[PDB]
Amino acid sequence: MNTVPFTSAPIEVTIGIDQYSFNVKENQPFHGIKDIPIGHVHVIHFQHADNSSMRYGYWFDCRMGNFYIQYDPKDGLYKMMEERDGAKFENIVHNFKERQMMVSYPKIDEDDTWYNLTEFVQMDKIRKIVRKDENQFSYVDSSMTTVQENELSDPAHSLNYTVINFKSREAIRPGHEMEDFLDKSYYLNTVMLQGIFKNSSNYFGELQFAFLNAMFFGNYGSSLQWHAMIELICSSATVPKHMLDKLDEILYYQIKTLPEQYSDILLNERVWNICLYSSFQKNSLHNTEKIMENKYPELL
Amino acid sequence: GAMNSSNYAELFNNDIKLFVDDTNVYRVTVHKTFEGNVATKAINGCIFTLNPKTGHLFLKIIHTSVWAGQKRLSQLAKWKTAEEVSALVRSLPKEEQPKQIIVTRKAMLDPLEVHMLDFPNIAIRPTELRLPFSAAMSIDKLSDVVMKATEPQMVLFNIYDDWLDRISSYTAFSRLTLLLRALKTNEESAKMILLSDPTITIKSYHLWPSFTDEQWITIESQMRDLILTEYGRKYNV
Numbered sequence: 001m002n003t004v005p006f007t008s009a010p011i012e013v014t015i016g017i018d019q020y021s022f023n024v025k026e027n028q029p030f031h032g033i034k035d036i037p038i039g040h041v042h043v044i045h046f047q048h049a050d051n052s053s054m055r056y057g058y059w060f061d062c063r064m065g066n067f068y069i070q071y072d073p074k075d076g077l078y079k080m081m082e083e084r085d086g087a088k089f090e091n092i093v094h095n096f097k098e099r100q101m102m103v104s105y106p107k108i109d110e111d112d113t114w115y116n117l118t119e120f121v122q123m124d125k126i127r128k129i130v131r132k133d134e135n136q137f138s139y140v141d142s143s144m145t146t147v148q149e150n151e152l153s154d155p156a157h158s159l160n161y162t163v164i165n166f167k168s169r170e171a172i173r174p175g176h177e178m179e180d181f182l183d184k185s186y187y188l189n190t191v192m193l194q195g196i197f198k199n200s201s202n203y204f205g206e207l208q209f210a211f212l213n214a215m216f217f218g219n220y221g222s223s224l225q226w227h228a229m230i231e232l233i234c235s236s237a238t239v240p241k242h243m244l245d246k247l248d249e250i251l252y253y254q255i256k257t258l259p260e261q262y263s264d265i266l267l268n269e270r271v272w273n274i275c276l277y278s279s280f281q282k283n284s285l286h287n288t289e290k291i292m293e294n295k296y297p298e299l300l
Numbered sequence: 301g302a303m304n305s306s307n308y309a310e311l312f313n314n315d316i317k318l319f320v321d322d323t324n325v326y327r328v329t330v331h332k333t334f335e336g337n338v339a340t341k342a343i344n345g346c347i348f349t350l351n352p353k354t355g356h357l358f359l360k361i362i363h364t365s366v367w368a369g370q371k372r373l374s375q376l377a378k379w380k381t382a383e384e385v386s387a388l389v390r391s392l393p394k395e396e397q398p399k400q401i402i403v404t405r406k407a408m409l410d411p412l413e414v415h416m417l418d419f420p421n422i423a424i425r426p427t428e429l430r431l432p433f434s435a436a437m438s439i440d441k442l443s444d445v446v447m448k449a450t451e452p453q454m455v456l457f458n459i460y461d462d463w464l465d466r467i468s469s470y471t472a473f474s475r476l477t478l479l480l481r482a483l484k485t486n487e488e489s490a491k492m493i494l495l496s497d498p499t500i501t502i503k504s505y506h507l508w509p510s511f512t513d514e515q516w517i518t519i520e521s522q523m524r525d526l527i528l529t530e531y532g533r534k535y536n537v
């Protein structure tokens with residue numbers, strides 16, 4: 001297990017760690033989060049008590065270095081940092097544990113939620129979407145736009161998701177205009193899976209990552225990306241059987257985890273009705289269709 | 301965006317544009333089978349592609365052979381229309397290509413947009429106008445060339461005959477839409493009006509009779525009465 005220590009907590013903030021969250025009061029003696037499961041990416045996120053504008057946060061992998069959080073009173077936010085001095089870090093962490101100033105990552109041992117939401121999220125790949133190569137962790141916030149959003153404004157701070165556009169020359173072969181627009185199998189399998197991603201695991205990785213940024217930061221462009229990647233599969237007549245089965249599991253856990261009260265703004269009515277009820281794969285997402293109909297029957 | 305009563309005069313400015321109507325592309329006669337079922341028999345159709353400023357009509361004849369062995373023909377018909385419009389644009393010199401294409405039914409937007417991805421600078425637009433272009437098949441010379449076609453064929457017409465020598469394209473379009481609206485509402489009576497006077501003839505190179513200015517006013521009035529008439533017979537007013 002690993003630890004993300006905090007120098008201090010000078011401003012009242014709701015702190016998130018993966019799907020968990022807790023409130024810290026201004027100048028409360030909070031010095032970080034312990035017992036973080038090794039082997040998964042993680043996200044630590046923040047919403048200031050005084051300005052719920054800007055949820056922001058850091059994707060990181062404890063295997064890639066020793067990371068801590070320290071408030072920056074000039075920039076006004078909790079910043080992730082790397083400590084290169086390993087003996088300094090161990091000594092800091094040990095003091096804070098002995099004095100029990102840390103919350104424990106509160107994993108129930110039956111619970112595979114986090115694994116099921118992040119199975120394909122690669123941390124080196126995340127550095128590809130969020131370009132800031134001098135850090136091993138990646139900052140995301142509510143307002144960051146995606147490369148596609150900037151086509152339709154600062155490129156350094158953008159989410160470099162794969163551009164999916166169903167009315168683009170990339171999606172449509174000359175001479176198969178009708179075939180390729182009504183059955184997106186070419187675009188999914190040849191252009192995206194065989195050309196850009198290389199394999200489905202990589203395809204699932206971006207898709208899972210797009211959802212988590214939508215859910216944790218309310219990042220609107222991430223939500224567009226998540227729905228686009230779902231829709232490209234559902235709108236394809238020819239999809240490997242193993243990909244459909246895994247998609248059903250992926251979406252089941254995403255729908256399961258979504259706040260009930262956030263469904264109105266995170267879920268695109270048109271895409272889901274189409275995917276579950278009109279598309280080629282309308283009969284192939286049994287788990288997802290069952291949880292959607294029992295949890296959000298309104299949307300349908 | 302969409303074309304309506306507020307931006308109506310844009311049709312007659314000097315940006316090349318075409319209307320595309322697909323309502324006569326896929327045409328069938330429904331009949332009973334010996335077993336007492338129902339089946340369709342397709343007949344020849346046409347794409348109606350019109351430059352409203354010049355009157356140039358690109359009539360692409362859709363021969364029934366294009367449907368052979370195809371499924372979901374009403375949906376294919378939209379994509380075949382879009383394919384032929386795109387082929388026509390590509391066939392035109394760059395300075396004759398349209399800047400905008402206005403489709404009369406919104407179901408054509410996505411098919412045409414997809415077939416025109418190579419022309420990102422051509423705007424594909426819907427309209428809220430209820431234009432009577434479906435009645436183009438009530439113009440005898442156009443119906444004749446479609447029904448006689450034995451193969452795919454493009455035929456060029458000027459749907460305004462020689463009117464633009466005397467009137468503006470706004471007034472010519474207004475005449476055309478009134479004629480077509482009447483032919484769509486009561487084809488028999490509409491054609492009776494147009495041909496009641498054997499002394500007025502249709503020139504071999506025209507579609508409509510050679511009315512003087514004054515006779516066109518009489519005709520246009522008679523067509524409006526007919527449209528008001530059928531409106532009363534329809535609604536009992």
Ligand SMILES: CNC(=O)c1ccc(OC)cc1
Nearest residue numbers: 121122125126202205206209
């Ligand atoms: C962008 N191409 C990819 O292969 C990809 C793979 C994993 C991943 O995780 C966030 C993100 C992207």
